[PDB]
Write a protein that binds this DNA or RNA. Sequence first.
RNA 1: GGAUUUUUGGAGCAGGGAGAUGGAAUAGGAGCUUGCUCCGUCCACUCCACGCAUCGACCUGGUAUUGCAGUACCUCCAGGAACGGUGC
Lengths: 72, 80, 162, 82, 95, 81, 62, 83, 73
Amino acid sequence: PLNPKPFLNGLTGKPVMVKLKWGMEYKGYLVSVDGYMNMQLANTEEYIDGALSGHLGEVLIRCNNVLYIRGV
Amino acid sequence: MKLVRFLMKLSHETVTIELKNGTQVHGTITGVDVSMNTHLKAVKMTLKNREPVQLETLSIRGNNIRYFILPDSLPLDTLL
Amino acid sequence: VKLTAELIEQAAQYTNAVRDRELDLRGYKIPVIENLGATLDQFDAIDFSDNEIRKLDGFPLLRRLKTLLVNNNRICRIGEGLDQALPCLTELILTNNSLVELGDLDPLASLKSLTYLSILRNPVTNKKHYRLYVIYKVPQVRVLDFQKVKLKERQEAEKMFK
Amino acid sequence: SSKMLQHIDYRMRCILQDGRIFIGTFKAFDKHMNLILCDCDEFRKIKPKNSKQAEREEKRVLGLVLLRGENLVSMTVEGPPP
Amino acid sequence: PEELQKREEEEFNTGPLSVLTQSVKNNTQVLINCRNNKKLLGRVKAFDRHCNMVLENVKEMWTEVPSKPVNKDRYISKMFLRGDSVIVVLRNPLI
Amino acid sequence: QKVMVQPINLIFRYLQNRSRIQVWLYEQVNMRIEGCIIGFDEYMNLVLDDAEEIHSKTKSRKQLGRIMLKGDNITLLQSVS
Amino acid sequence: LVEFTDEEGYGRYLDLHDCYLKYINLKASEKLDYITYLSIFDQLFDIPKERKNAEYKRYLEM
Amino acid sequence: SIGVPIKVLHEAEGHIVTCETNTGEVYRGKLIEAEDNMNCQMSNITVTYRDGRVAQLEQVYIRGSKIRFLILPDMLKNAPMLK
Amino acid sequence: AHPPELKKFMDKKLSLKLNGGRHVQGILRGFDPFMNLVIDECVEMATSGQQNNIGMVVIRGNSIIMLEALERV
RNA sequence: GGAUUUUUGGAGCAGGGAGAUGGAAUAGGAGCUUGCUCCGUCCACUCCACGCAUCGACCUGGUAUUGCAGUACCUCCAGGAACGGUGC
């Protein structure tokens, strides 16, 4: 079984694809997800429709939007 | 340290708040509380594609406010 | 007895039987019509019954006027520029006034939302082709004095007064 | 300070969250400040979709409406205390 | 109290709040992706668990369609963005 | 008079039998992520496995697999198998 | 009553705080304060610090 | 604590309300049972969903996170809240 | 923390309107004080006249707009 | 006391095509005023899928009721649509 808190414990460091609620995605290493579960992603490629448009690198992606964060 | 007292330490200073309903209200807000609860006093508010409406007593909500703009000659260290 | 702002501030403003925001003047006898702006647009109906009002004019700029009650009046003639101050005013309770002439309602055509009126017991009501001139010169009104306007009477009102 | 209690009992035009309005004499309040409007007027927009027709704002009779905190945004003071 | 305030200090230091940690240590100019797609740039002054960001030297940009989108951009000297509108908090921008 | 059909009980049953299901969205009937839930938690946030988000309008699906749907956007999961 | 400012006093102060805010929203620089605003806006035909060929002319007109 | 608008909706329980939810849904009918979570189980309601065709149905249940507004009986103008 | 008054609506056939314009008819059996539901034989009809029954679904109170019960229970 | 039922928000986005149809008294850039030509914001009519279906009043006729009640909206036909907003 994979509870999502251990899922973030195991996926922190791996390439997270974070798709937001507007569809804003970031493909980059996820750094941390705390008790507020607002994620932190570094070396991010900002994917719109699944095609990275920018490279924001280090950033803190607030949890209020990220639709999913998966290992790519 | 949340921004509660950073927002609440304010009374009747010419500031410019942005309500998340695409509108802005500038003026001397009456008083703020801990949960971003601020009223308006003699405030000039511009809405989305609308007129410079005037409010004598308007009660601005907290999460329906999108941002704040403080005075320019205020020390944020001494404010927050 | 001058019409003043005390007889405005002591007035009643509420949601009356017709779900309209009415300001009422019980026992006013005001022969001077002006200075209603501080009505504050929280009102749509303006009733001034029991008034010595000699003329139908002198009203300020409101956007949401719904009913005008000039009931139990003493009007001699009517002023013209009521339309820019009443954009969408529709009901006019204007009986018991000294309206006679076919030109006593010539400013009525400027009412865009006019739907109903009552001008009974006036020397102008009793005349022939009076409802003809009514349903002609108020083309928008579909009912006046407790009876709807009709296609035949409207055709007759068009034919006459040419 | 529970500030609203000083301006209550007199008529204010509040907003909705969808651009409309609610004009009434504020009766009582709560923690979340969801409002209680007495003999409320609901002045909303009517979709013009045209430049050759005007833009009107029609208000229906709501009476005593208990408007949720999802509707209370900003409420100007426009009426005398009834 | 003391231990809880230190715990919030650590949540700002070695958590996902490390973005605002750098923003308050080195004063890095921060991109603020707002929920209305309004891009804000400026140096940060204060931070909170709720991602409430105090800002300085603030510039606001938004693409308005009059079409062909025009990137309108203006200045607010100081700024305050409580954690409601901010969608993403970018520590280092390309500019 | 009645007993629990608990939501966490349904989530645990899904994640324990590896029950594949399509998960809807909040504010949008557009996408549904079909997959087997890898686990559950306190606040109903579930982790995924073999999940693909398929649209009702586009009729196409982008693969996420080990997805992590946020707990507020979750609308309802319909058991596929 | 309707045409007097409080910072004005019916002829003691002026209405220029919004003017300073608009100068800021036009310039986009933190090196402009009340001193520079007065030294720029006092001159009649003194050298412009902000463009009379850009929207600075309209802002000065307002 | 307990909010006085919610207490007025309790005083309007049993009897008919006219509520409007997130989707413009206008349900005009007897609002029977409700909670401080604004989750009101009601009955005998003409629910229109803002489309114009209101249907007269029984045992509806409207939450409050969707609640745009709710008209409650005017006779509660003498409710202990305002006085 | 308050539980709802859902014990009467338990074991009832309910046509509920969920967000996105969805219409789901189903059986309430037992719920969570957050109104977190599990609906038996839940048939959620799409915008069109096409519908499907999915049996066991943990539905949202964030997405459920309202609900109606077709019986007097 | 920002993780599903009220205020650290799921908001914001733009209005279907086209025709040697018209307009910008005062506002467009280029061909270095005017004359002429092009292009990126609407409306008015005409063409298509009058954007459709639904319904709530609504305008006209005809059509029934004479009926003591504290009110979502109440007879019915037909339309032409002046309106509100839903599903795509």
